[PDB]
Write a protein that binds this DNA or RNA. Sequence first.
RNA 1: CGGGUAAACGGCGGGAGUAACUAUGACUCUCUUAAGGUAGCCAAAUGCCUCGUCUUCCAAUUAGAGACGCGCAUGAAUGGA
RNA 2: GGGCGGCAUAUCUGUUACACGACAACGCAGGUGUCCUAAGGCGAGCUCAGUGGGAACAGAAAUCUCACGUAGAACACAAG
RNA 3: UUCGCAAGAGUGAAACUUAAAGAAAUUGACGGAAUGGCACCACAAGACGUGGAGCGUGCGGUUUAAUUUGACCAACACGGGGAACUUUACCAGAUCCGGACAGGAUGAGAUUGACAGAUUGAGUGUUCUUUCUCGAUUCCCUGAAUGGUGGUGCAUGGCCGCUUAUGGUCGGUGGAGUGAUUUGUUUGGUUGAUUCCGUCAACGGACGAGAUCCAAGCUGCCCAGUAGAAUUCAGAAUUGCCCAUAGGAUAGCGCAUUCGGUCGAAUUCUUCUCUGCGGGAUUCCUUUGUAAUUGCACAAGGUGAAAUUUUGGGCAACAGCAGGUCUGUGAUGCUCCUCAAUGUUCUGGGCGACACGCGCACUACAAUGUCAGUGAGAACAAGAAAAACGAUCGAACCUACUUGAUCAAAAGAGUGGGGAAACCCCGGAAUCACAUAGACCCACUUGGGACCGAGGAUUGCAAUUAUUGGUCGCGCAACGAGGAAUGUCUCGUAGGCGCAGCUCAUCAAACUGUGCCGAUUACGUCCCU
RNA 4: GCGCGGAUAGCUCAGUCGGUAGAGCAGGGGAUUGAAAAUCCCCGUGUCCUUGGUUCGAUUCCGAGUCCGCGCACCA
RNA 5: GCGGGGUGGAGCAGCCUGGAGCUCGUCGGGCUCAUAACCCGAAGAUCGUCGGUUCAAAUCCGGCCCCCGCAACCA
RNA 6: CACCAUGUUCAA
Lengths: 105, 80
Amino acid sequence: PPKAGQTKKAKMEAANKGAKKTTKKWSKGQSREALQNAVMFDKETYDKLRSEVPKYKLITPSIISDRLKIAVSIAAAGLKQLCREKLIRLVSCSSKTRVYTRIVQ
Amino acid sequence: GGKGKKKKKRIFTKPKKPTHRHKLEKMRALKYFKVTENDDGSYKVERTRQDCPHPQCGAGVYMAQHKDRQYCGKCHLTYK
RNA sequence: CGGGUAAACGGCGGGAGUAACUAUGACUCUCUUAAGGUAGCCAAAUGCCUCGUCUUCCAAUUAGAGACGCGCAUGAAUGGA
RNA sequence: GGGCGGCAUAUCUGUUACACGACAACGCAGGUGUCCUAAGGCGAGCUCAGUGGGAACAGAAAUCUCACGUAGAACACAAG
RNA sequence: UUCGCAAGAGUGAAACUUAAAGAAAUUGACGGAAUGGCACCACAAGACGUGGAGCGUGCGGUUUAAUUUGACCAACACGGGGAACUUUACCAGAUCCGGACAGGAUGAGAUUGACAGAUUGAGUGUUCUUUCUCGAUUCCCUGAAUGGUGGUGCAUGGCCGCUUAUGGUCGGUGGAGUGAUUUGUUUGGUUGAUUCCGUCAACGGACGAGAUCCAAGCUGCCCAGUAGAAUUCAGAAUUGCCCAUAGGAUAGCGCAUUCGGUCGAAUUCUUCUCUGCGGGAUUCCUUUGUAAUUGCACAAGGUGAAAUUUUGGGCAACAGCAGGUCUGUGAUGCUCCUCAAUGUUCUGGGCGACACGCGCACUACAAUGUCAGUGAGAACAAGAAAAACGAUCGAACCUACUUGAUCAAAAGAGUGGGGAAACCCCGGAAUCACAUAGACCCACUUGGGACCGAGGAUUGCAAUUAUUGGUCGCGCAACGAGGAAUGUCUCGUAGGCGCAGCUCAUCAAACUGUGCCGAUUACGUCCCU
RNA sequence: GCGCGGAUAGCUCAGUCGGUAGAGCAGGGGAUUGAAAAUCCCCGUGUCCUUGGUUCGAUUCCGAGUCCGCGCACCA
RNA sequence: GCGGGGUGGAGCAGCCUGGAGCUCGUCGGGCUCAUAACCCGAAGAUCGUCGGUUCAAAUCCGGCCCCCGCAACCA
RNA sequence: CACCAUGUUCAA
Ligand SMILES: [K+]
Ligand SMILES: [K+]
Ligand SMILES: [K+]
Ligand SMILES: [K+]
Ligand SMILES: [K+]
Ligand SMILES: [K+]
Ligand SMILES: [K+]
Ligand SMILES: [K+]
Ligand SMILES: [K+]
Ligand SMILES: [K+]
Ligand SMILES: [K+]
Ligand SMILES: [K+]
Ligand SMILES: [K+]
Ligand SMILES: [K+]
Ligand SMILES: [Mg+2]
Ligand SMILES: [Mg+2]
Ligand SMILES: [Mg+2]
Ligand SMILES: [Mg+2]
Ligand SMILES: [Mg+2]
Ligand SMILES: [Mg+2]
Ligand SMILES: [Mg+2]
Ligand SMILES: [Mg+2]
Ligand SMILES: [Mg+2]
Ligand SMILES: [Mg+2]
Ligand SMILES: [Mg+2]
Ligand SMILES: [Mg+2]
Ligand SMILES: [Mg+2]
Ligand SMILES: [Mg+2]
Ligand SMILES: [Mg+2]
Ligand SMILES: [Mg+2]
Ligand SMILES: [Mg+2]
Ligand SMILES: [Mg+2]
Ligand SMILES: [Mg+2]
Ligand SMILES: [Mg+2]
Ligand SMILES: [Mg+2]
Ligand SMILES: [Mg+2]
Ligand SMILES: [Mg+2]
Ligand SMILES: [Mg+2]
Ligand SMILES: [Mg+2]
Ligand SMILES: [Mg+2]
Ligand code: NA
Ligand code: NA
Ligand code: NA
Ligand code: NA
Ligand code: NA
Ligand code: NA
Ligand code: NA
Ligand code: NA
Ligand code: NA
Ligand code: NA
């Protein structure tokens, strides 16, 4: 075995006692600002969804959340409602993803 | 750690146990029998030691006698 | 301001560690200058300590000579040997 | 002695200094050449330094509260 | 001592020290010398990681009565090494002789074994008190002998690993050298190849390479009551007008579809499946290609299931290494212990012990996601017992079905089947899919489960140092993609995903295989090794 | 001649001036080795200089010192 | 008598209140067959000691203990 | 044409 030369038991003991914590953090990280997204609709936010969200060429739950500062869970819920009232039309659909667009005229 | 199969030479605290030697009783069968004399001159002998009841335990073999118990060598059954 | 010039006047460092007995320090670290004293020479008419230390000279040597050199404060035409 | 040192060369407080005032030394202990538009002026409110009992994080020590507190604080800088 | 301005030049010892110093050639090895090739245990173009976190595991240290020990590219999930007891080799203690045999002293009383009380960790005759039983098997002591996971792998055998994954190695006779040695075995092209063609002081051979062998893909004969299929009769089901809570896209335009429980019959057959010998592929075919100026070949395309060692393995020469193993063996020499044993059993502990450092894994850091549903769907494989025990079978082994169930999981039971193409099994694996109109919505958060608490069940002679599941809590434990460094890899491959076997009474973060989903990049080079 | 500073393990050198003995090297025994060097682990050490006040007691506070270092001793 | 200095284990800045820096050394991990060199990180300070000032002292004001200089002349 | 130092003693 590579038994270190001139290494003491006191040298050993002082090595492990100083080996706790210290060296770490090999990544920069670059922290981000928190996203304050509302979990329920306000009166003015719900008014924007019924009026401003239509006549958008591309409509997506993640897009609407980025506009109205709301959660995607309720952003998707409002979009499903706007389809029930035929204000927007659904172009691509799956379990995980829905794409909507404005109606013609 | 220690050397491979090196003699230990450990001290002993307890006294050494001697080996058990069989204590020999001289003329054993003379003690198991008491000789009686009949008026015709013939001698009748009856054993003073009990017989172990179990047929598997020595049909025709004797049974010990202590002050507190009575047991046998073969059947190992004891009476108190 | 920018160059040259010391046979112009002149000037020519300090602290610490280190070799398998122990001294010592070839070796290394560090602070530093315009350059950090080179070849030599020396208790020299130049050494304070100092009547330095060793050898020699005497019966006895603060003297003399030969050595050594941490040289208060030796040293190169302020010419060195 | 002079020189080197210092300054006793202009000047403030305490002590020497002897209970009026005055008093020497290169006597002792320290200061002065500055600083302040507020650190000047006035009015009004308040009480300081410290302790003690208590109140999350709170611990000797952060802030709140009640008492006691003759100055034991502060008044730019030496001292009275 | 002579000469020289000096620097020096001429002449020129000894004491002492030493077994070689030298010369030229040979074979190796080495070169920050040259030439030609090759290899992702190399790089290039990249992939996915490891190095950062938690945890499993091995290694070193520390600790300890002991934390048994080997190994330091080619040691470190390696010793098939996942150790509760055993294993087990270590530590604290207690038994047995498994000291055969020979020679002596006892001896038909040599001895063996023991209930009760206590000695003890032991309702352990170990020993002791007290006796009974046994019987010539044994005890006493002298030599000897045996056993040992004792030492020594630097005394060895065998086996293995490595040099060393490349193309290497060796005689005979002849030639050349005084000889080691050389030629053959060489250069040119080619090839993975000392593979071939050509040349030739070499001619003939031998081994390795290739061939052979085993699995994959295509196919022939054979073949089925341990594999299946298609029809025909019957018996049952849907049946046409229907437009989803918003309902898009995607085949149908003589007889309409289904129904492995409808456990229904009959007939026919080998399309799938099973497999012992075969076939099939070799540069075979073609370039106004490269090369050829003979050749050996090569590159593109064709034929084809397969197009270049077809793909993946197995085997693998000669020389070695003081490589590993004396911990596989009744493999072993020498040596060590040998009756309070280094033998052998039994009890308990340890191998796991934690300021720390390292190898290899596992799980992650989330939305190309986590949960809760639903669908369709593999392959390799394993399954029970004796000169024992019960009445030649029957129980151990693996399962399916039912029940438990008039209410959690894990369980627990009953019945039946399977000696394994027959039962499991129509093998309902997980990645995966879902127009699921499902929840979450960027946060150390429904990510991540480390750590810990209480209940309960199972395996075992024994669960404390949690053996392992299952339930509810903790989750405020790090971890938000990882510095310098560094591993493996060219196509059904990497990466991902499970499954079986193996260790296994109980326990896979392991290995050995297996199939599933399936790429990026390169078709090179000698810059690094 | 006087003043100052040192006398601690076998050697060298630390020690809160008042409870302190820290070590390195030299030795004995193990780990490693094919045997060694080297390296690591475990063990034997000690008031100095002499009296007093002894802080409750002294290398550590005083007196004497030895024994060694380091300075300095008419005037013209 | 006059002037300057004690700062991580070594040498040396900062000494211009609110603070300790540089090189080496030490430790951990890399590269290497291994050491050095080299690469990536870490730890280590009563700023001699005793007081005072200040809201606050390496840093300002005094005492002490050392270290280094310059003076010590005419008799 | 950047930098690239070293390897304790005997014996296989
Ligand atoms: K001058
Ligand atoms: K004389
Ligand atoms: K005022
Ligand atoms: K030669
Ligand atoms: K290899
Ligand atoms: K270990
Ligand atoms: K055993
Ligand atoms: K061998
Ligand atoms: K070869
Ligand atoms: K010849
Ligand atoms: K080639
Ligand atoms: K092989
Ligand atoms: K061989
Ligand atoms: K050297
Ligand atoms: Mg000189
Ligand atoms: Mg001189
Ligand atoms: Mg003179
Ligand atoms: Mg004279
Ligand atoms: Mg003289
Ligand atoms: Mg002289
Ligand atoms: Mg001079
Ligand atoms: Mg001069
Ligand atoms: Mg005067
Ligand atoms: Mg008066
Ligand atoms: Mg008066
Ligand atoms: Mg590599
Ligand atoms: Mg890790
Ligand atoms: Mg780590
Ligand atoms: Mg290799
Ligand atoms: Mg391994
Ligand atoms: Mg286990
Ligand atoms: Mg044993
Ligand atoms: Mg054996
Ligand atoms: Mg060997
Ligand atoms: Mg040859
Ligand atoms: Mg060879
Ligand atoms: Mg045991
Ligand atoms: Mg282990
Ligand atoms: Mg539990
Ligand atoms: Mg294993
Ligand atoms: Na006022
Ligand atoms: Na001469
Ligand atoms: Na040669
Ligand atoms: Na690469
Ligand atoms: Na990583
Ligand atoms: Na010949
Ligand atoms: Na020949
Ligand atoms: Na042996
Ligand atoms: Na190369
Ligand atoms: Na020797």
